[PDB]
Amino acid sequence: SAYRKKGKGKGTTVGMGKSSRRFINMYGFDPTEYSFIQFVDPLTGAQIEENVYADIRDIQERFSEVRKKMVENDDIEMQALGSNTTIHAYFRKDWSDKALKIDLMPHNPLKVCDKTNGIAKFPERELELRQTGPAVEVDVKDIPAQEVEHE
């Protein structure tokens, strides 16, 4: 008697795969809104936030600071004092695209006193506050503005 059972020969087919995937997502936004009139002085260059119902009481209050530093700094003597009425009003375009520059004056007109030839004016009446000058429209970026610089 005799027997031979040779074999038991099998194999294995294994196979895996690396599953690695990167991803990058980021999006910001600068939601800014501003609708008002920018007040500025022609003399030096004061700055104040005025609106449709801007009250002189306010503009005069903050103005005190500007004028204070001006005279304090000691730069002039009567350059600013010589004239203190005309104000520069900076308006903003409808779509805040361009910037309008219009100057305005107070409602306190004066007159000259003299008892000798006091009629050196043209034949007109109702002489009231007239337009001191035309308006200047220029892009906020166009005008000489100290654009903020990134840190």
UniProtKB/TrEMBL annotation:
GO terms for biological process: proteolysis. GO terms for molecular function: cysteine-type peptidase activity. This is VPg. It comes from Potato virus Y. The lineage of its organism: Viruses, Riboviria, Orthornavirae, Pisuviricota, Stelpaviricetes. The chain holds residues 38 to 185 of 185 of the full protein.
